[PDB]
Design a protein around this motif. Sequence first.
Motif, PDB file in Angstrom:
ATOM      1  N   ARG A 254       0.818  -1.205   0.000  1.00  0.00           N
ATOM      2  CA  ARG A 254       0.000   0.000   0.000  1.00  0.00           C
ATOM      3  C   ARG A 254       0.856   1.260   0.000  1.00  0.00           C
ATOM      4  NH1 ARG A 254      -5.913   0.599   3.018  1.00  0.00           N
ATOM      5  NH2 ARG A 254      -6.685   1.590   1.098  1.00  0.00           N
TER       6      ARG A 254
ATOM      7  N   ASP B  96      -5.396   4.056  -8.103  1.00  0.00           N
ATOM      8  CA  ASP B  96      -6.209   4.683  -7.078  1.00  0.00           C
ATOM      9  C   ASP B  96      -7.537   3.952  -6.899  1.00  0.00           C
ATOM     10  OD1 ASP B  96      -5.492   7.149  -5.435  1.00  0.00           O
ATOM     11  OD2 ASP B  96      -7.511   7.736  -6.001  1.00  0.00           O
ATOM     12  N   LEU B  97      -8.168   3.512  -7.994  1.00  0.00           N
ATOM     13  CA  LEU B  97      -9.425   2.786  -7.834  1.00  0.00           C
ATOM     14  C   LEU B  97      -9.196   1.417  -7.215  1.00  0.00           C
ATOM     15  CD1 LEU B  97     -10.071   0.299 -10.213  1.00  0.00           C
ATOM     16  CD2 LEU B  97      -9.928   2.349 -11.644  1.00  0.00           C
TER      17      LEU B  97
ATOM     18  N   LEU C 181      -6.873   0.919  -5.056  1.00  0.00           N
ATOM     19  CA  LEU C 181      -6.648   1.299  -3.676  1.00  0.00           C
ATOM     20  C   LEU C 181      -7.949   1.514  -2.929  1.00  0.00           C
ATOM     21  CD1 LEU C 181      -4.318   1.984  -1.768  1.00  0.00           C
ATOM     22  CD2 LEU C 181      -4.641   4.364  -2.375  1.00  0.00           C
ATOM     23  N   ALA C 182      -8.996   1.952  -3.628  1.00  0.00           N
ATOM     24  CA  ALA C 182     -10.287   2.139  -2.975  1.00  0.00           C
ATOM     25  C   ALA C 182     -10.799   0.835  -2.383  1.00  0.00           C
ATOM     26  CB  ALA C 182     -11.300   2.691  -3.970  1.00  0.00           C
ATOM     27  N   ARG C 183     -10.713  -0.250  -3.144  1.00  0.00           N
ATOM     28  CA  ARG C 183     -11.231  -1.553  -2.735  1.00  0.00           C
ATOM     29  C   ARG C 183     -10.134  -2.426  -2.166  1.00  0.00           C
ATOM     30  NH1 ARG C 183     -14.735  -2.884  -8.210  1.00  0.00           N
ATOM     31  NH2 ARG C 183     -16.122  -1.063  -8.065  1.00  0.00           N
TER      32      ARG C 183
ATOM     33  N   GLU D 109     -13.625  11.118 -11.870  1.00  0.00           N
ATOM     34  CA  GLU D 109     -13.495   9.769 -11.347  1.00  0.00           C
ATOM     35  C   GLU D 109     -12.371   9.687 -10.333  1.00  0.00           C
ATOM     36  OE1 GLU D 109     -15.512   6.857 -11.790  1.00  0.00           O
ATOM     37  OE2 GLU D 109     -14.225   6.547 -10.038  1.00  0.00           O
ATOM     38  N   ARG D 110     -11.280  10.417 -10.547  1.00  0.00           N
ATOM     39  CA  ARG D 110     -10.257  10.494  -9.512  1.00  0.00           C
ATOM     40  C   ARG D 110     -10.837  11.111  -8.250  1.00  0.00           C
ATOM     41  NH1 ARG D 110      -5.836  10.094  -6.697  1.00  0.00           N
ATOM     42  NH2 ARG D 110      -3.832   9.931  -7.797  1.00  0.00           N
TER      43      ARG D 110
ATOM     44  N   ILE E 286     -12.958   8.529  -6.560  1.00  0.00           N
ATOM     45  CA  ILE E 286     -12.278   7.607  -5.661  1.00  0.00           C
ATOM     46  C   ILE E 286     -11.908   8.326  -4.381  1.00  0.00           C
ATOM     47  CG2 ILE E 286     -10.375   6.026  -5.365  1.00  0.00           C
ATOM     48  CD1 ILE E 286     -12.293   5.153  -7.668  1.00  0.00           C
TER      49      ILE E 286
ATOM     50  N   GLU F  40     -14.876   8.530  -2.438  1.00  0.00           N
ATOM     51  CA  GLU F  40     -15.174   7.206  -1.922  1.00  0.00           C
ATOM     52  C   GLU F  40     -14.391   6.949  -0.647  1.00  0.00           C
ATOM     53  OE1 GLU F  40     -14.787   4.088  -4.761  1.00  0.00           O
ATOM     54  OE2 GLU F  40     -15.678   2.608  -3.406  1.00  0.00           O
ATOM     55  N   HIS F  41     -13.108   7.302  -0.651  1.00  0.00           N
ATOM     56  CA  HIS F  41     -12.320   7.226   0.573  1.00  0.00           C
ATOM     57  C   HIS F  41     -12.926   8.104   1.654  1.00  0.00           C
ATOM     58  CE1 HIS F  41      -9.173   5.620  -2.174  1.00  0.00           C
ATOM     59  NE2 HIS F  41      -8.827   4.946  -1.093  1.00  0.00           N
TER      60      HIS F  41
ATOM     61  N   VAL G 197     -18.561  -2.258   4.323  1.00  0.00           N
ATOM     62  CA  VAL G 197     -17.647  -1.813   3.277  1.00  0.00           C
ATOM     63  C   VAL G 197     -18.325  -2.129   1.952  1.00  0.00           C
ATOM     64  CG1 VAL G 197     -15.311  -1.951   2.320  1.00  0.00           C
ATOM     65  CG2 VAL G 197     -15.702  -2.233   4.774  1.00  0.00           C
TER      66      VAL G 197
END
Lengths: 181, 181
Positions: free
Chosen positions: A7, A72-73, A75-77, B45-46, B49, B52-53, B149
Amino acid sequence: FKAERLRVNLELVINRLKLLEEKKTELAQKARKEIADYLAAGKDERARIRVEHIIREDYLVEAMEILELYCDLLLARFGLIQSMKELDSGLAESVSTLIWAAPRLQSEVAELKIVADQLCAKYSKEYGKLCRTNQIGTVNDRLMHKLSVEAPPKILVERYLIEIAKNYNVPYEPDSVVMAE
Amino acid sequence: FKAERLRVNLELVINRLKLLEEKKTELAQKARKEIADYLAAGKDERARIRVEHIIREDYLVEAMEILELYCDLLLARFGLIQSMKELDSGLAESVSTLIWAAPRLQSEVAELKIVADQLCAKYSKEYGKLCRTNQIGTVNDRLMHKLSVEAPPKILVERYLIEIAKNYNVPYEPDSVVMAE
């Protein structure tokens, strides 16, 4: 596996992505004034090779941004698919493109070495030596074009030289066989 | 058992809860201006994310407040249930939710390690390896949603982006298939 080393690796990847994007932007501006010099000074073909290197770099820029979105996406999941044990379809495109471009990006970054190892350490279903080679077929074809190594169409390299000569105010005369092509 | 080590642990838990709540608030404000930047600048979209975080973080915020209430109410009846030897129903919900979320919160805090040990050291009736697993079924389902989650519904992530674009004054156009969903 070492998923937080992974990570923080990704975080450094993103940091250096930004940094390298910025640095290459800076020197690309200097190199564009320099290309204005070469075009203005004689060997436009020398400037043509220079701008070939530059448009290569720009393919790299676009590819960098695409994969930045991908890392990054993913990293989201992190924890979500970490709960899972196989890759999902929602990340299959990103994973396939990343797996495919990773050997192309092995050299550009040392963190990604571990990122790819941990990827393959994450999965075996459509993962491994050839199973990973089997699942990697879902790579982004647009990035593939942004990661294709080719000469652009000389009408377009002429158009890049034309729009450079426009922006940088040099006289450029494309090869009319190519300026018509 | 070490019930005052447990107690000062809980006090540090509350202190760091407040501290982390505050710190994450601060950086979340900076990150919201930053999300206004990303949305304003290209890759929504960036920014998607990123937010989303952030909405993940907000689920954590809400869960933090819920469990803060839970640890404080358990702290109220420290000596009382300490006189008892099994957990009561008045604290069964809090205890079940805490026991259930504790492994999710094992990493977030090291005091809670001891807090969970002392919890299990406190009881064996509906407590232990699986007996604790049996009694933990009374976890807060609302916190469970605040500890689920998942991707929010893209109508709602679009609404978060819409109300961000409202509050932060960027142009956001939701995907009409999702903006209608």
